Design a protein around this ligand. Structure first.
Ligand code: HEM
Ligand code: HEM
Ligand code: HEM
Ligand code: HEM
Lengths: 146, 141, 141, 146
């Protein structure tokens, strides 16, 4: 993504303060609750009949953590999101059969999570940068789909 | 909301389709799969090659639903209620894809109804397809 | 359709907003302009600088419409028909921007209501804003 | 856009047969009728109160030609839709204040005009290629918005 240098500096500054363990579990959980059709892909994660069932789900919690990890790494390579996520893009398509639209839903929910978390510190300009990143990521992930 | 003119327009266009509907269903899906590869994510269990019988079959099924939607233009909700449950509770097709097929269905129609595919019809069909889409995704959450 | 729970969640969430809805509307507007610059295309005539009183002002307005939408949750179609006519007939704002403002509102609410911005409340408010958006662009054609 | 050679081949090969005069008028025209809100920008065109008022509107037919002509030229430099559309990007943003989503709507309308007119000759594969094009353009045309 073509992020200003203060965009990448701001994205970066904040990320350092995020607790990946948790944020990821919170982001993925909120996805499943807000857009329940996304649950289609996690039938083996057990109970997701309720918000508490979803948010406290240890599997959701565990999955959430791997996502954010991968996300974290893409952030070390803003200049090469596509190379970064190339293997994950093929997997999601060819093996997981996940519609790329889910990547966009997740990036927005993630933005709501970060906002939820940094409060006043998550300013308009910080958000603007974050949107760009999330979009870079969903596009990077949807790139090898065919 | 469909005006009485829209309804006329669509009843008209669709009456023209007649016995090809099925033909045209399968065609629109085909176009979809090739033009919007992402849409294939939902048919991992189908043969998607050109000529696929699975695709032909399903095409009919889709067509038949459109026909039915046409017949009940004034109570689409009731007529389609059951498909709404299915796409909402089982298929769980991201709402975005409805816009894709509607466009593919529209292209198809235009290629088979030179004469009838008028600006006014075009516009009425878009609206009818968007209403069908709206119905099918009304039970998502 | 908003369920009894959605309505509860939203009446409460909005309740909380309270005395800041102006402040919030404005802030969400700033968020939207920065994040989705294409949105500025509808406000050529405005001062879209940080602090603009023109933005604050309009933000109040947007907020008061939402408060009023919340106030008439069981009859949103009628409660906002005036604004639907307006957006549909005079302004002619592309339907896709309603989703962006909504996202920004959510983001502003989340930033400000830590305690209340619960998964369940988030899902409810998301549904509400989507319903508002639906009302507002219902007369586009 | 990533066009296949048979992709450019077929794109280029169908365009060759396009009468830009009426395809151009028919596409802008249909846009105004199908997506009434787009009219916003052509109040100066007159009476658009009807499908007929619009379709036979010469101010529409003439703008349509210009648009198709410019589109028509981006086909010559597939390899750099952005350089090509750079100035048109900034104009439509900064002067006309046109929302980029309109460009996306036109592209779809355009694919419909082409299918209408070429019929059996506008095959799935061919539509596919064009979808890529219309996308590229939309994108190229929205690229300098700020
Ligand atoms: C922000 C973008 C995303 C990232 C970085 C990401 C990352 C990952 C990673 C690292 C894995 C495990 C790799 C492996 O097992 O080989 C995975 C698996 C998976 N991803 Fe994603 N993912 C993303 C978005 C999504 C979304 C939005 C969905 C659907 C809502 C999804 C559905 C899945 C599924 C279903 C699996 C396998 C889960 C299972 O173990 O059953 N992914 N993803
Ligand atoms: C207005 C648009 C649509 C109509 C009229 C429609 C109609 C139908 C019909 C009639 C069925 C078969 C159910 C039965 O046998 O009772 C079906 C199932 C299905 N639909 Fe749709 N549908 C629409 C949109 C979509 C979209 C956009 C997608 C995803 C790209 C989709 C994915 C599916 C799938 C995957 C099935 C399962 C069929 C099978 O597994 O054999 N549908 N739909
Ligand atoms: C939930 C969504 C929305 C609500 C509740 C809303 C509400 C309003 C209200 C209350 C007014 C002013 C009417 C008056 O002065 O009586 C207005 C005007 C306006 N709205 Fe919206 N609106 C929404 C979405 C949008 C979107 C998405 C855009 C474009 C991005 C937009 C652009 C405008 C513009 C340009 C004006 C006129 C500005 C002026 O001259 O002061 N609105 N809207
Ligand atoms: C492929 C997409 C498009 C192309 C290639 C294109 C091209 C052009 C060109 C060449 C001009 C004249 C500027 C000049 O050279 O001085 C123009 C002007 C204009 N465009 Fe577009 N355009 C496109 C889409 C749109 C859309 C979708 C809209 C809104 C519905 C729009 C609204 C306008 C308006 C209002 C003008 C000014 C007309 C006048 O008063 O002279 N354009 N466009």
């Amino acid at each position: 993504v073509h992020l200003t240098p203060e965009e990448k500096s701001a994205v970066t500054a904040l990320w350092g303060k995020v607790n990946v363990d948790e944020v990821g579990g919170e982001a993925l959980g909120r996805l499943l609750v807000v857009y329940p059709w996304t649950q289609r892909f996690f039938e083996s994660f057990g109970d997701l009949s309720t918000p508490d069932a979803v948010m406290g789900n240890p599997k959701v919690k565990a999955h959430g953590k791997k996502v954010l990890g991968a996300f974290s790494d893409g952030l070390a390579h803003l200049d090469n999101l596509k190379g970064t996520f190339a293997t994950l893009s093929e997997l999601h398509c060819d093996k997981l059969h996940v519609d790329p639209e889910n990547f966009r839903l997740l990036g927005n929910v993630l933005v709501c999570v970060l906002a939820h978390h940094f409060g006043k510190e998550f300013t308009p300009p910080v958000q603007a940068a974050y949107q760009k990143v999330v979009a870079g990521v969903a596009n990077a992930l949807a790139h090898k789909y065919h | 909301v469909l005006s009485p003119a829209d309804k006329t327009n669509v009843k008209a266009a669709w009456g023209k389709v007649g016995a090809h509907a099925g033909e045209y269903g399968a065609e629109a899906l085909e176009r979809m799969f090739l033009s919007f590869p992402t849409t294939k994510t939902y048919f991992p269990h189908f043969d998607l090659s050109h000529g696929s019988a699975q695709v032909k079959g399903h095409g009919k099924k889709v067509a038949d639903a459109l026909t039915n939607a046409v017949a009940h233009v004034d109570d689409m909700p009731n007529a389609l209620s059951a498909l709404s449950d299915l796409h909402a509770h089982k298929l769980r097709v991201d709402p975005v894809n409805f816009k894709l097929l509607s466009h593919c269905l529209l292209v198809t129609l235009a290629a088979h109804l030179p004469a009838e595919f008028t600006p006014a019809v075009h516009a009425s069909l878009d609206k009818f397809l968007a209403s069908v889409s709206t119905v099918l995704t009304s039970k998502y959450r």
